[PDB]
Write a protein that binds this ligand. Structure first.
Ligand SMILES: [Cl-]
Ligand SMILES: [Cl-]
Ligand SMILES: [Cl-]
Ligand SMILES: [Cl-]
Ligand SMILES: [Cl-]
Ligand code: NA
Length: 129
């Protein structure tokens, strides 16, 4: 599913991400924009052989099981395919664990490089929330 901007903002808020660990909703929308262009089916292989999955490009090295990432963990206790669903529940619940891991949203390199320090409220501007 390719979400609309405000559609995704509303779904993330309903799933409790708004201000989660202090990160306002626009941070999460901005991260999803640059990780996946709001496409739940996005996948991308990493140089180390792991793969990133879903709207927030969650990595099989630590967070989900895809059966082909040697030496990895599955700390969200989910198949990586669950992160591709039209229902964002699994991606949200896993993102909550990731963002609590110590480095906050810096875990998402694209958030650090493209969202951090910017006017992230622009990502939710105009949305009925
Ligand atoms: Cl957009
Ligand atoms: Cl915001
Ligand atoms: Cl594996
Ligand atoms: Cl599995
Ligand atoms: Cl933080
Ligand atoms: Na894994």
């Amino acid at each position: 599913k390719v979400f609309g901007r405000c559609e995704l903002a509303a779904a993330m808020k309903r799933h409790g991400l708004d201000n989660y660990r202090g990160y306002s909703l626009g941070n999460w929308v901005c991260a999803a924009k640059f990780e996946s262009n709001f496409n739940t089916q996005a996948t991308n292989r990493n140089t180390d052989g792991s793969t990133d999955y879903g709207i927030l490009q969650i990595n099989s090295r630590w967070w989900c099981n895809d059966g082909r990432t040697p030496g990895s963990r599955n700390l969200c206790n989910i198949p990586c395919s669950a992160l591709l669903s039209s229902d964002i529940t699994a991606s949200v619940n896993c993102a909550k664990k990731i963002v609590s891991d110590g480095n906050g949203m810096n875990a998402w390199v694209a958030w650090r490089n493209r969202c951090k320090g910017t006017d992230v409220q622009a990502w939710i501007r105009g949305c009925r929330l």
